[PDB]
């Protein structure tokens, strides 16, 4: 009747309906021998028991308990127990666990993610292991940053085991799991991809070969794209050469922004820059390293080292009171009296361009709600400016 | 003495979960035919719920302290009838019982707000052992007189040692979160089952008018469960009654392949050590 | 003027990485082969399509022959 299709339910079909059909009718063949005598002795030799009792007296046989409250006392009835001993205590053993196994696969992951009102969330997906989602946790939501509102939305393939689960209790409000895959146009649906601020793509940087890594990001962006045209995305790569196969799809808006990341590229441009400049390299990649302030007393390198660590880089718009200001002016008041350094500014014209350092008189202060870059300790102090009256 | 009032205690949880269950489904059926400071309030319930917080922090030990301290009330308690009358002014217990059950309904209340979907918060073991064990003592202290119903429920509370620990940051590996979860699951369900035996050997059949009742003390139910569950059966002590039997066929069912693929791994997992360190 | 135009034959070894080759089409991994916009364009190929091509052969008599004179260009 194509009630059955699939192969687990008919495995647990053919299971129960044999178990169960053996145990009821060895229960009544001993219920029939006891109830009656033996015939040799002219059936003087009976016993009274009910059907049910039999039934509880084979489980008991079966599962090897023993208990002995109730036993057989005719010759037949002894007979077909050494012969049912024999046989179903094999059937008992191997048949229970079978069952207790095949229910219990149940999918801990299914389900749908509401969706918040005036509350935005993101969606990652890509190649998702421990290290890598407990350092991207502990630089996310990390507290130098200014108060976020963000809600995170793993999305993979393969059910995580217990550490990673101990890890999504520790961070139980801010972070869910669903289980699917990116390419099947549901899971997309399933995860309110349609409203999300943007998707991120983690991509495995040890791999065999380069290119398959490549090939199977473009086939993630692509769906995406396809699935919805206009929603911003990170990527990683690792080729520089395959950077140019991104802007073959139609609606890959990098204007808008739209970024990826090519880590062979940035390496080399680090240990060249270097090159010039001894420590640049690492003095520059502290700067994007969420990291808080550490004090020691034992009068050694690292008391000064830690020091320099705690900076990281923000971005904010500058007050009104800059107006007409030379670079070099602006940088140094900024410096002496809010002990901020304002490291370089973009310039704000029909097309975007930004200026590293400028000389006086070359370049006045466009305040046109310019933005400028900035270093400092935490997000807190960067809006000590933008707030500058004459105060 | 007198009328029996067993049957005001089973129902008054009976009609908390049904009805909870009604009232939820229906609201949910009338949105579909008639077709944020909210959000705020459930996030701090989260919060506190989580130990992110200090005052997280201290919440969830009182529970894992308050969890023992009411199941210790329970084990005191069996040795007295089933069915009897006290004043509640005059007793230092369902007093100090009292109390508990006034945290534990708050507890509840802050867990029902951080769940997403109610109604399949409302189905969840938490939810019903707490639905089962909570009204019972409010309508004994109303009525003066007390049974000993379903209060053997208690010790279900064990499972969530697994979590509440995980949430303070103890358990990080791979190994103590196994053996913590083989352990707690093994107890409970052990102590769960004696107690149920507890109440239906000591209590009679109720059609037969309890006149087949056998004496029993919850030690030897628990001593008798963990014979059947070795399958050692000596013949000494066995359940009488048809609900006692009842009962042992599917326990017997179940428990064997529980213990069977349970100790093994347990003994296992204890005793890796590196038998040629140190210094 | 752009590259649009082009016309294009491809083969493919798996027939799901269909969705892949428009833009413009309604992708979803239920329907089959014959319904898909580059199918029934007359872009895309895959060899799957001609297992049918046993059953056919044995009730008609010289099917076989017919397809390769007008394919293969003499037999
Ligand atoms: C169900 C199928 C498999 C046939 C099984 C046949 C035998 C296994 C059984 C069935 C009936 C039994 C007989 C039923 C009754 C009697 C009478 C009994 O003697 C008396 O009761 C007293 C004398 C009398 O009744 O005439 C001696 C055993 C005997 C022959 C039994 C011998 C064993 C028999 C032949
Ligand atoms: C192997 C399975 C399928 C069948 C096994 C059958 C046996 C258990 C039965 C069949 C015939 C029976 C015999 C039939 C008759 C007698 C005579 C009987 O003698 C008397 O009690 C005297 C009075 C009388 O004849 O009834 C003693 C038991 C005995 C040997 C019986 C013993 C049990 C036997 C061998
Ligand atoms: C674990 C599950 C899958 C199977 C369990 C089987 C047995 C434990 C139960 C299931 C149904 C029960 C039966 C259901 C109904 C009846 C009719 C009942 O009849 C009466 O009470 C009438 C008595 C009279 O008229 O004198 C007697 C018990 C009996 C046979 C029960 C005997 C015990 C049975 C076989
Ligand atoms: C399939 C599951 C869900 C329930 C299996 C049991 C039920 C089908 C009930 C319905 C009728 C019951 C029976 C009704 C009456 C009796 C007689 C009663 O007689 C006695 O008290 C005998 C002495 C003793 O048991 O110590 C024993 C239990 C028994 C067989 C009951 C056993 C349990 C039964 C089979
Ligand atoms: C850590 C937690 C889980 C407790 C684990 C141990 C309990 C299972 C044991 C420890 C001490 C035991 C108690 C020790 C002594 C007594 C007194 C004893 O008194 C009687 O026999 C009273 C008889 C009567 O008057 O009716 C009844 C059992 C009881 C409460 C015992 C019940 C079981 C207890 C609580
Ligand atoms: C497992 C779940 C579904 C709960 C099942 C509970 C029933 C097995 C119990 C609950 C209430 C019981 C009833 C409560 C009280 C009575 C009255 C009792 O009669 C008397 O009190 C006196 C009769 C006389 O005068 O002889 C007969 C049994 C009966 C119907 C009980 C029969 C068994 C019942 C239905
Ligand atoms: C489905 C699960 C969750 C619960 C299963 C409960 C059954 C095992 C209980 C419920 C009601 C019980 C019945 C309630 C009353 C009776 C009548 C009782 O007989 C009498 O009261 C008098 C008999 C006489 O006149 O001698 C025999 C047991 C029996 C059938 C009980 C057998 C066991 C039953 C079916
Ligand atoms: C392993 C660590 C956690 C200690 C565990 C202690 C329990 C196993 C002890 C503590 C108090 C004991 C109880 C104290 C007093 C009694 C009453 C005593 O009463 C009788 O002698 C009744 C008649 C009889 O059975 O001989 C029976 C044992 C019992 C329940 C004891 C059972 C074993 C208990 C619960
Ligand atoms: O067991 C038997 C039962 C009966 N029914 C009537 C009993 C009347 C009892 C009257 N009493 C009044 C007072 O007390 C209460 C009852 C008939 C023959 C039997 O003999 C069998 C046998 F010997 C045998 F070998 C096999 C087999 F296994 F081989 F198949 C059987 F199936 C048998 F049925
Ligand atoms: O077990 C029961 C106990 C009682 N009161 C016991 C005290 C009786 C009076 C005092 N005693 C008199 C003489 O003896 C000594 C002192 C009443 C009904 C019961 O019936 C249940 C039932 F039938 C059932 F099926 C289930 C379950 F299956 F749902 F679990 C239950 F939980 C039940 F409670
Ligand atoms: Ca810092
Ligand atoms: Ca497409
Ligand atoms: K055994
Ligand atoms: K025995
Ligand atoms: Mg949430």
């Given at each position: 009747?194509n009630?059955?299709?699939?192969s687990?339910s008919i495995?647990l079909v053919?299971?129960?309906?044999i178990?169960?059909?053996?145990?009821?009718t060895?229960?009544?063949?001993?219920?029939?021998v006891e109830?009656?005598?033996?015939?040799?002795?002219?059936?003087?030799?009976?016993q009274?028991?009910?059907?049910?009792?039999?039934?509880?007296?084979?489980?008991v046989?079966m599962s090897?308990?023993?208990?002995?409250?109730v036993?057989?006392?005719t010759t037949?009835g002894?007979?077909?127990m050494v012969f049912?001993?024999?046989?179903g205590?094999?059937?008992?053993?191997?048949?229970?666990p079978?069952?207790?196994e095949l229910i219990?696969?149940?999918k801990?992951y299914?389900?749908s993610?509401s969706?918040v009102?005036?509350?935005?969330?993101?969606?990652?997906?890509?190649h998702i292991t421990?290290?890598?989602?407990?350092?991207?946790?502990k630089?996310?939501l990390?507290?130098?940053?200014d108060?976020?509102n963000?809600?995170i939305?793993?999305?993979?393939?393969?059910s995580?085991?217990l550490?990673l689960?101990?890890?999504?209790?520790?961070?139980?409000t801010?972070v869910?799991?669903?289980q699917?895959?990116?390419?099947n146009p549901?899971?997309l649906?399933?995860?309110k991809?349609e409203?999300?601020?943007?998707?991120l793509?983690?991509?495995?940087?040890?791999?065999?070969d380069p290119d398959?890594?490549?090939?199977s990001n473009i086939?993630?962006?692509?769906?995406?794209?396809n699935?919805h045209?206009?929603?911003?995305?990170?990527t990683?790569?690792l080729?520089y050469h395959?950077?140019?196969?991104?802007?073959?799809?139609?609606?890959?808006?990098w204007?808008?922004?739209d970024?990826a990341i090519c880590l062979?590229?940035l390496?080399l441009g680090?240990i060249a820059q270097?090159?010039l400049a001894q420590?640049?390299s690492?003095?520059?990649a502290?700067?994007f390293?969420?990291?808080?302030?550490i004090?020691?007393?034992?009068?050694?390198?690292?008391k000064?080292?830690?020091?320099g660590?705690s900076?990281?880089m923000?971005?904010?718009?500058l007050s009104?009171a800059?107006v007409?200001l030379?670079?070099?002016?602006?940088?140094?008041l900024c410096?002496?009296?809010l002990?901020?350094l304002?490291i370089?500014?973009?310039?704000?014209?029909?097309?975007?361009?930004?200026?590293?350092?400028?000389?006086?008189?070359?370049h006045?202060?466009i305040?046109?709600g310019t933005?400028?870059?900035?270093?400092?300790?935490?997000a807190?102090?960067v809006?000590?400016?933008?707030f500058y009256?004459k105060? | 003495?007198?009328?029996?009032?067993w049957?005001a205690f089973?129902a008054?949880?009976?009609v908390?979960?049904?009805?909870?269950?009604?009232i939820?489904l229906?609201?949910?059926?009338?949105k579909?035919l008639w077709?944020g400071?909210?959000?705020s309030?459930?996030?701090?319930?989260?919060?506190?719920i989580?130990?992110?917080t200090?005052?997280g922090?201290?919440?969830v030990?009182?529970?894992?302290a308050?969890?023992?301290?009411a199941?210790?009330?329970?084990?005191?308690?069996s040795?007295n009838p089933?069915?009897?009358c006290?004043?509640f002014?005059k007793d230092?217990t369902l007093?100090?019982?009292?109390?508990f059950?006034?945290?534990?309904?708050?507890?509840?209340?802050?867990?029902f707000i951080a769940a997403?979907?109610?109604?399949?918060?409302?189905l969840?073991?938490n939810?019903?052992?707490?639905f089962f064990?909570?009204?019972?003592?409010?309508?004994?202290?109303?009525?003066?007189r007390?049974?000993l119903?379903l209060?053997?429920?208690?010790?279900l509370?064990?499972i969530?040692?697994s979590e509440?620990?995980?949430?303070?940051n103890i358990?990080?590996?791979?190994?103590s979160?196994?053996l913590?979860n083989?352990?707690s699951?093994?107890?409970?369900?052990?102590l769960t089952?004696?107690?149920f035996?507890?109440?239906?050997?000591?209590?009679?059949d109720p059609?037969?008018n309890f006149?087949?009742n056998?004496?029993?003390?919850?030690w030897?139910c628990?001593?008798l469960?963990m014979?059947?569950?070795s399958?050692?059966?000596?013949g000494?002590?066995?359940?009488?009654?048809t609900?006692?039997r009842?009962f042992?066929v599917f326990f017997?069912l179940?428990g064997?392949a529980?213990?069977?693929?349970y100790v093994?791994?347990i003994?296992?997992?204890?005793?890796?050590?590196?038998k040629?360190?140190?210094? | 003027?752009?590259?649009?135009?082009?016309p294009?034959?491809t083969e493919?070894v798996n027939?799901?990485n269909?969705?892949?080759?428009?833009?413009?089409?309604?992708?979803d991994?239920?329907?089959?082969?014959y319904?898909?916009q580059?199918?029934?364009?007359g872009?895309?190929?895959?060899?799957s399509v001609?297992?049918?091509?046993?059953?056919?052969?044995?009730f008609?008599?010289?099917?076989?022959?017919?397809?390769r004179?007008?394919?293969?260009?003499?037999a």
């Amino acid at each position: 009747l194509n009630i059955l299709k699939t192969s687990n339910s008919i495995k647990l079909v053919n299971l129960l309906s044999i178990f169960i059909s053996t145990w009821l009718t060895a229960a009544g063949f001993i219920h029939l021998v006891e109830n009656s005598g033996d015939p040799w002795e002219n059936f003087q030799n009976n016993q009274a028991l009910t059907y049910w009792e039999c039934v509880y007296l084979l489980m008991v046989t079966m599962s090897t308990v023993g208990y002995g409250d109730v036993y057989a006392k005719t010759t037949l009835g002894r007979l077909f127990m050494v012969f049912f001993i024999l046989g179903g205590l094999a059937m008992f053993a191997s048949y229970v666990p079978e069952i207790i196994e095949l229910i219990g696969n149940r999918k801990k992951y299914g389900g749908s993610y509401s969706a918040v009102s005036g509350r935005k969330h993101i969606v990652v997906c890509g190649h998702i292991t421990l290290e890598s989602v407990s350092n991207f946790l502990k630089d996310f939501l990390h507290k130098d940053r200014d108060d976020v509102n963000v809600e995170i939305v793993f999305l993979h393939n393969i059910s995580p085991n217990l550490e990673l689960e101990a890890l999504f209790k520790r961070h139980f409000t801010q972070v869910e799991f669903y289980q699917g895959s990116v390419l099947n146009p549901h899971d997309l649906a399933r995860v309110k991809i349609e409203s999300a601020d943007a998707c991120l793509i983690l991509a495995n940087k040890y791999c065999a070969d380069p290119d398959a890594e490549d090939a199977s990001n473009i086939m993630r962006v692509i769906s995406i794209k396809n699935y919805h045209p206009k929603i911003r995305i990170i990527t990683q790569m690792l080729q520089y050469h395959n950077k140019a196969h991104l802007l073959n799809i139609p609606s890959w808006n990098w204007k808008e922004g739209d970024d990826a990341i090519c880590l062979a590229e940035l390496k080399l441009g680090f240990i060249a820059q270097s090159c010039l400049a001894q420590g640049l390299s690492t003095m520059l990649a502290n700067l994007f390293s969420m990291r808080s302030f550490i004090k020691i007393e034992e009068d050694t390198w690292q008391k000064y080292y830690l020091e320099g660590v705690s900076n990281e880089m923000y971005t904010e718009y500058l007050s009104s009171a800059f107006v007409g200001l030379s670079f070099p002016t602006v940088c140094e008041l900024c410096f002496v009296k809010l002990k901020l350094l304002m490291i370089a500014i973009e310039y704000k014209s029909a097309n975007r361009e930004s200026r590293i350092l400028i000389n006086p008189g070359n370049h006045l202060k466009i305040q046109e709600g310019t933005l400028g870059f900035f270093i400092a300790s935490d997000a807190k102090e960067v809006k000590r400016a933008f707030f500058y009256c004459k105060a | 003495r007198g009328q029996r009032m067993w049957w005001a205690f089973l129902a008054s949880s009976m009609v908390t979960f049904f009805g909870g269950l009604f009232i939820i489904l229906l609201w949910r059926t009338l949105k579909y035919l008639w077709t944020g400071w909210m959000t705020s309030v459930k996030d701090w319930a989260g919060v506190m719920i989580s130990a992110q917080t200090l005052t997280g922090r201290v919440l969830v030990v009182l529970v894992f302290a308050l969890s023992i301290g009411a199941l210790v009330i329970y084990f005191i308690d069996s040795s007295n009838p089933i069915e009897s009358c006290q004043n509640f002014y005059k007793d230092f217990t369902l007093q100090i019982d009292m109390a508990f059950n006034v945290f534990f309904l708050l507890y509840f209340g802050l867990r029902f707000i951080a769940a997403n979907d109610k109604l399949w918060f409302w189905l969840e073991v938490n939810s019903v052992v707490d639905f089962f064990t909570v009204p019972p003592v409010f309508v004994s202290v109303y009525l003066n007189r007390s049974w000993l119903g379903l209060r053997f429920l208690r010790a279900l509370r064990l499972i969530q040692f697994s979590e509440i620990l995980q949430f303070l940051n103890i358990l990080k590996t791979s190994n103590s979160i196994k053996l913590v979860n083989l352990l707690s699951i093994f107890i409970s369900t052990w102590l769960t089952a004696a107690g149920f035996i507890h109440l239906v050997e000591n209590s009679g059949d109720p059609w037969e008018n309890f006149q087949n009742n056998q004496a029993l003390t919850y030690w030897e139910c628990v001593y008798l469960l963990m014979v059947t569950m070795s399958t050692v059966g000596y013949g000494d002590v066995y359940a009488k009654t048809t609900l006692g039997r009842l009962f042992m066929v599917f326990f017997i069912l179940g428990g064997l392949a529980m213990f069977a693929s349970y100790v093994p791994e347990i003994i296992e997992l204890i005793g890796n050590r590196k038998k040629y360190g140190g210094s | 003027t752009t590259g649009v135009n082009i016309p294009i034959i491809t083969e493919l070894v798996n027939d799901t990485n269909v969705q892949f080759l428009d833009q413009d089409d309604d992708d979803d991994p239920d329907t089959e082969l014959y319904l898909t916009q580059p199918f029934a364009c007359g872009t895309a190929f895959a060899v799957s399509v001609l297992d049918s091509l046993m059953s056919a052969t044995y009730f008609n008599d010289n099917i076989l022959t017919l397809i390769r004179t007008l394919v293969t260009g003499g037999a």
